Amino acid sequence: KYTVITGASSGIGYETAKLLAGKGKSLVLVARRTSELEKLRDEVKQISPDSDVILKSVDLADNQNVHDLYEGLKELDIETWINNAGVGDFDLVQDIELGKIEKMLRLNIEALTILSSLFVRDHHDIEGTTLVNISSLGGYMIVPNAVTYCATKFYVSAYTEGLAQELQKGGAKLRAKVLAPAATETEFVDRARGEAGFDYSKNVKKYHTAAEMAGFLHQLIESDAIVGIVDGETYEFELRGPLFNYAG
């Protein structure tokens, strides 16, 4: 029985793999950097010798890549699916690189939608399955100079909040949860601005570590809440219900 983590090679996804390793889970680790994946597998195996680990070097910004990934995993007994892979961009709309933004839409929205839909299709009446989508506090609150990114996270928030409440109204066994982290110390900002070495310690007053966020992720799965969100003012992690208006 497997937990699937896209974007496992660094950051939130990486620390989540090490946490579920310590809980003895078997994992499917997806990302492009095979070198990083094989590195994380070794740590998983050292943490948890009897945990089986499958790697998938896959660029999820391509739509058939996404379909092929899920088709390759149907042989498997998946209890948890985590759409963690995701990139930002810090730029005015007038200055964006259309190709980077397009890649972002395809990763942040499409891959997550395709994978959520296929998983929902196949696991909606299977007891004990969970679907976790990673959004951001920026999916509930627009941040200046990250308009296009925030909009992809509002999509993930509204998508997953609606899907969660759809499954509840339908008595589905599958559970669907959305995580909304705040400043988390990952490679997200370096990747977003295109240059490495941004120092959270020196530049950001409030932020969680990736290992902390992996724990909040684990709390969310182990709970009845649809939303696990970091409050922007207190920086507390709160398990709670949907934030967006629902017509049901």
72 CB-near residues (< 8 Å, 6+ apart): 56
Burial bucket for residue 67 (CB in 10 Å: 0-12, 13-18, 19+): middle
Which parts of this chain interact with ligand NAP (CB under 6 A)?
7-13, 31-33, 36, 58-61, 84-88, 107, 134, 136, 181, 183-184, 186-188, 191
To its own copies, the closest distance from the beta carbon of 95 in angstroms equals: 8
Tracing tokens 């259309």 back to the chain, one arrives at 98
Binding-site member from 49, 74, 75, 98 for its own copies (CB under 8 A): 98
Was 240 annotated as part of a binding site? no
φ, ψ of residue 162 in degrees (nearest 5)? -70, -45
To ligand NAP, the closest distance from the beta carbon of 132 in angstroms equals: 11
Was 137 annotated as part of a binding site? no
59: contact with its own copies by CB under 8 A? no
Q: What is the β-pairing status of strands 237-240 and 227-230?
A: antiparallel
Binding-site member from 38, 62, 110, 212 for its own copies (CB under 8 A): 110
CB neighbours of residue 114 within 10 Å: 18
- Residue 36's binding partner, choosing from its own copies, ligand NAP, none, with beta-carbon cut-off 5 to 8 A by kind? ligand NAP
To its own copies, the closest distance from the beta carbon of 121 in angstroms equals: 5
Was 187 annotated as part of a binding site? yes
Comparing every residue's Cβ against ligand NAP, the nearest one is: 11
What gap in Å lies between CA 57 and CA 36, rounded to an integer?
10
Per-residue contact string for residues 131-160; x = within reach of its own copies by CB under 8 A: ---------xxxxxx-xx-xxx-xxxxxx-
Binding-site member from 121, 171, 197, 224 for its own copies (CB under 8 A): 121
Was 60 annotated as part of a binding site? yes
105: contact with its own copies by CB under 8 A? yes
Was 201 annotated as part of a binding site? no
Task: Taking the CA atoms of 103, 107, 108 and 113 in sequence, report the sign of the dihedral they define.
Answer: positive
Binding-site member from 5, 44, 134, 163 for its own copies (CB under 8 A): 163
What is the CA 95 to chain-centroid distance, rounded?
27
To ligand NAP, the closest distance from the beta carbon of 59 in angstroms equals: 5
What gap in Å lies between CA 55 and CA 75, rounded to an integer?
15
Give the SS3 label for residue 84.
coil
Helix axes 112-123 and 147-169, enclosed angle (nearest 10): 10
Element (H, E) at 117: helix 112-123
Was 83 annotated as part of a binding site? no
Annotated binding site for NADP(+): 7, 9-10, 12, 32-33, 59-60, 84, 86, 153, 184, 186-187, 191
